[PDB]
């Protein structure tokens with residue numbers, strides 16, 4: 001133990017997270033960007049409709 | 057029962073070569089399907105006949 | 118009332134197609150009316166009002182209770198040094214030696230006396246539940262359930278269609294929690310463990326960590 | 339009797355003044371007993387009668403259903419479990435659940451599939467009872483009629499208004515008796531026919547007062 | 558139709574003789590897989606693993 | 609090095625979420641064509 | 644190899660893989676027959 | 681009259697009669713092989729089970745066809761009980777209910793001289809039947825002597841010993857032959873004839889494969905020497921190693 005390191009390359013931890021602060025970083029950034037998108041959905045058209053896409 | 061099978065299986069290829077060639081000619085002629093409707097049914101069923109006939113005696117060989 | 122899919126005669130019902138027709142006093146102008154009064158407790162219009170304050174306050178406590186019971190328990194499993202993370206074993210943190218340290222941090226609240234906690238709870242909860250009935254500095258004559266004003270700072274409840282839509286979301290998120298907070302009580306009496314410890318075990322082997330493994334627990338003996 | 343003013347009463351002769359106004363005597367089982375004033379509303383008093391009758395009909399199937407797997411144990415028929423409340427856990431058994439002592443019967447093994455079939459089957463027949471189903475739509479919610487009465491017993495309405503009073507009185511007995519089976523198995527721990535035999539063994543010593551000091555706070 | 562076809566491999570590995578398990582001791586051979594690992598944390602650990 | 613790994617995950621998942629929630633915001637109507 | 648009741652048919656089965664290549668060549672033959680209308 | 685309600689949804693009654701009656705109805709071949717001009721004119725969409733399937737022109741006019749409906753419907757209904765009569769005792773023989781002769785083709789050989797045929801009742805239990813062989817025949821010839829005669833005359837006995845008490849101590853004449861709806865319908869099923877007009881489509885179709893199944897029962901029992909429940913279970917044990925075309929060359 002000459003040096004201290006991660007020891008996490010061959011471990012196969014999911015999404016590369018090993019410290020549970022990374023999961024909150026993965027999720028907390030995601031929820032914030034979702035929250036700004038969900039509020040601003042009021043401007044993006046209201047397609048609550050039978051068929052209202054970019055149809056052909 | 058080998059030679060019973062081989063004559064039956066040479067018979068299959070002759071019928072299949074008819075059905076590969078004749079059947080698109082039956083469809084793509086004008087009114088050729090209304091005319092040879094029962095004719096193709098003879099050729100199709102005889103194909104379905106022999107494939108079980110060849111299929112059953114494999115247990116006997 | 119607009120065409121808002123939740124209010125009026127075309128509203129969805131609690132048995133779907135098999136409901137037929139709701140009771141004659143549930144006409145669909147109050148939130149969460151799926152027309153379920155099959156015992157008829159609220160046939161009187163004065164009595165039917167009194168359950169709606171009784172339902173909505175139960176919702177507004179249970180939605181705090183559903184998040185409040187798991188969120189210290191969730192962070193406790195990721196290394197936050199709580200005294201106890203389990204919600205039904207967290208009340209007895211006042212009797213340990215270091216006191217109730219908030220977040221497990223000794224330089225936070227550091228409560229010692231259970232009498233001092235309860236002595237100041239009643240003197241505050243009396244006043245604000247007293248203010249909820251009437252009066253109080255944040256609004257004098259308002260609604261008993263949707264006061265608004267200083268209790269809606271961000272202005273989210275101004276349009277009469279959107280505000281009539283969010284009342285349906287409030288009670289359905291509420292009724293989800295009251296049903297679920299009832300679940301926390303029963304699966305703590307039965308299982309004896311924290312409510313995510315029940316979850317992480319059902320994800321382990323779902324065929325054998327279901328509730329039927331505890332079915333013979335209360336056999337008369 | 340059983341209708342109108344002169345009928346049977348819950349205090350018998352000592353009952354002419356305790357009877358409220360709204361309990362007149364057009365309904366079956368109207369003995370005029372609303373001591374706690376619960377059904378003072380005409381819509382709500384209509385609503386409890388569906389609750390009472392359905393509880394009455396489930397209890398009549400609950401009374402006999404809790405008895406016949408123990409009377410047949412007295413005829414020496416092997417069950418694996420003959421007690422009514424211990425009967426549910428026999429799908430956890432090694433042989434599983436056979437409908438009698440016959441492994442060539444149902445032979446149930448998986449609890450979760452048995453429950454999931456129930457929530458589909460009982461989930462839909464309870465919905466037919468409310469709105470309607472294959473056996474009729476616009477009927478009386480409690481006495482629907484013809485496909486459930488094939489034998490034509492619901493004719494001559496003076497008999498039909500009398501068979502209703504037979505129904506709830508057997509029924510109110512059954513709901514009272516099923517409240518028995520729960521308590522006499524919580525307190526004792528044995529079956530009803532078995533604890534009937536305990537009382538018929540020595541009645542003076544085998545009563546509830548033999549278990550009266552059980553639930554004391556031992557702290 | 559594409560979900561039922563997944564079950565044919567499952568049924569053939571659990572009832573119909575099994576499949577060739579090359580990790581069997583002493584050289585691989587045909588093995589009926591009696592106990593399939595169906596743990597969701599084990600199964601979904603492959604998908605969110607780095608490549 | 610853990611302080612650096614928690615920073616890359618904030619950076620990447622910021623820009624990855626501008627991508628995913630960017631194309632959802634009615635991009636196929638952000639065209640000069642008319643109908 | 645093939646079964647012994649089937650072994651006189653080995654020369655026919657050595658043609659069979661090449662057949663689907665001849666379907667894309669047929670579609671150019673047919674379009675020359677309609678003269679690329 | 682019978683205001684009823686649909687099973688899943690919220691509307692009962694007939695689903696569609698126009699799939700099964702009239703000119704537009706299901707046929708034994710689709711539209712591309714068989715148009716509406718190749719239909720024999722004595723088969724129109726006015727009886728149940730009429731897919732127009734008649735290559736061999738056995739029928740001539742619908743009056744002749746109608747007496748073969750008597751041969752069709754009666755062959756159906758006796759076959760439908762036989763499929764249950766064959767499979768059900770064999771599985772109970774397989775699981776452990778001792779029928780001692782549940783397999784269908786060698787049932788009579790089990791009860792020849794000692795008799796003692798054993799009967800299992802679900803869910804009452806197992807009951808031995810201490811009747812001899814000659815007692816069964818005099819009952820069977822005695823009952824189906826009367827039963828078949830009752831269909832011959834068109835009328836029968838007025839008394840309702842047979843499983844009904846709906847008080848018709850009289851004979852019946854105005855019934856339909858092939859649909860004796862009077863005493864034989866205890867549970868209703870008789871108000872809307874549009875319901876019955878679809879139920880009879882289900883009746884012949886459930887019947888027709890049961891006639892096929894008994895034909896499937898007898899032949900595949902003769903080939904391999906098993907009851908069809910034993911044939912059903914072992915084909916599910918391993919299908920490729922146990923089919924038609926592995927039992928014909930099993931000796932080699």
Ligand code: CHL
Pocket residue numbers: 204205206207208209210211231234235238302305306
């Ligand atoms: C808000 C409702 C409330 C509820 C449901 C509880 C419940 C509990 N407290 Mg708690 N408390 C509550 C408020 C408060 N407590 C405390 C201070 C403490 C202390 C010091 C301790 C507890 C303990 C307990 C637990 C007893 C173990 C148990 O019951 O076994 C399991 C069974 C259940 C969880 C079922 C309980 C459900 C309950 C019977 C039904 C809920 C309805 C209630 C009747 C409504 C109560 C509100 C009323 C008073 C208006 C239990 C989880 C003890 C503990 O920590 O346990 C180890 C303990 O030492 N509490 C204060 C500060 C004064 C409170 C403020 O209001």
Ligand code: CHL
Pocket residue numbers: 346347348349350351352369
């Ligand atoms: C004139 C005599 C007469 C008397 C006194 C009664 C009395 C009663 N009748 Mg009535 N009847 C009478 C005549 C008649 N009744 C009826 C037909 C009916 C019916 C159909 C019914 C009644 C019912 C009742 C009961 C209604 C009140 C109640 O529920 O008390 C309940 C409360 C008590 C009895 C007191 C508490 C119980 C116990 C004595 C206390 C002892 C404590 C324990 C030892 C320990 C405590 C446990 C602790 C430790 C946890 C009551 C027992 C109802 C009934 O059966 O209720 C069950 C009912 O359904 N009667 C007819 C036929 C026409 C009568 C003919 O004259």
Ligand code: CHL
Pocket residue numbers: 441442443444445446447448449451452455767768770771772773775802909
């Ligand atoms: C998982 C193990 C399991 C097995 C191997 C069986 C198998 C059996 N069940 Mg049981 N069951 C099982 C569990 C369960 N069953 C049932 C509900 C029933 C019912 C309602 C019935 C049975 C019947 C039967 C018996 C077939 C009698 C016969 O001779 O064929 C006669 C039948 C045929 C020839 C056609 C059907 C073929 C097949 C055997 C299906 C029958 C079995 C069940 C419907 C479920 C299928 C189980 C799978 C795993 C084989 C046989 C012992 C039948 C019976 O009780 O007869 C005495 C019957 O009516 N079971 C439930 C609740 C959903 C179960 C859950 O644990």
Ligand SMILES: CCCCCCCCCCCCCCCCCC(=O)OC[C@H](CO[C@@H]1O[C@H](CO[C@H]2O[C@H](CO)[C@H](O)[C@H](O)[C@H]2O)[C@H](O)[C@H](O)[C@H]1O)OC(=O)CCCCCCCCCCCCCCCCC
Pocket residue numbers: 014015017023026027028030031032034035038041042043044045046047632
């Ligand atoms: C080791 C483990 C590591 C884990 C890492 C975590 C990885 C997580 C991976 C998740 C990947 C999912 C990505 C795709 C999401 C698609 C969302 C969407 O298309 O969304 C589309 C829909 C649109 O919803 C609709 O939006 C409508 C908007 O209406 C508005 O707008 C309309 C016109 O636009 C009208 O104007 C109308 O008046 C107006 O009200 C209405 O509100 C409808 O009621 C509503 O159904 O959104 C929705 O349903 C969304 C439903 C799902 C939401 C999920 C949220 C999850 C949050 C988790 C917890 C986060 C905590 C955050 C904390 C933040 C602070 C720190």
Ligand code: CLA
Pocket residue numbers: 710711712713
């Ligand atoms: C992708 C598959 C597909 C689809 C969607 C259709 C769709 C249709 N066909 Mg075509 N057809 C197909 C394959 C398909 N067919 C094949 C493979 C053949 C050769 C046998 C035909 C031959 C055919 C004819 C000759 C006719 C149709 C007709 C029809 C029409 C429906 C009427 C009808 O009952 O069909 C008739 C076909 C059947 C009843 C087939 C029997 C049902 C099969 C056996 C079910 C088995 C499904 C099973 C899951 C398959 C296993 C999957 C895999 C392992 C192979 C409809 C447009 C008719 C039409 O358009 O009228 C003019 C018509 O005349 N089809």
Ligand SMILES: CC(=C/C=C/C(C)=C/C=C/C=C(C)/C=C/C=C(\C)C=C=C1C(C)(C)C[C@H](O)C[C@@]1(C)O)/C=C/[C@@]12O[C@]1(C)C[C@@H](O)CC2(C)C
Pocket residue numbers: 761823826827837838839840841842
């Ligand atoms: C195939 C089959 C046919 C049964 C036909 C019957 C039951 C005829 C009844 C037949 C019943 C008969 C003939 C009773 C007849 C009684 C009569 C006429 C008595 C009478 C009178 C008189 C004389 C006083 C005169 C008066 O004026 C009229 C009347 C009426 O009052 C049964 C098969 C099965 O039973 C097995 C073999 C095995 C089981 O496992 C499966 C099933 C399917 C159940």
Ligand SMILES: CC1=C[C@H](O)CC(C)(C)[C@H]1/C=C/C(C)=C/C=C/C(C)=C/C=C/C=C(C)/C=C/C=C(C)/C=C/C1=C(C)C[C@H](O)CC1(C)C
Pocket residue numbers: 371372373374375376393394396397399400401402403404421422423425426512513514516517
């Ligand atoms: C009238 C009046 C008047 C005044 O005014 C007031 C007052 C007084 C309040 C009132 C009174 C009331 C009362 C008394 C009530 C009671 C009720 C009941 C008890 C019911 C039961 C009820 C009961 C019931 C249903 C029951 C049911 C049961 C069942 C199904 C069972 C089942 C089973 C079985 C088979 C067996 C198996 O092994 C199991 C089980 C599962 C177990």
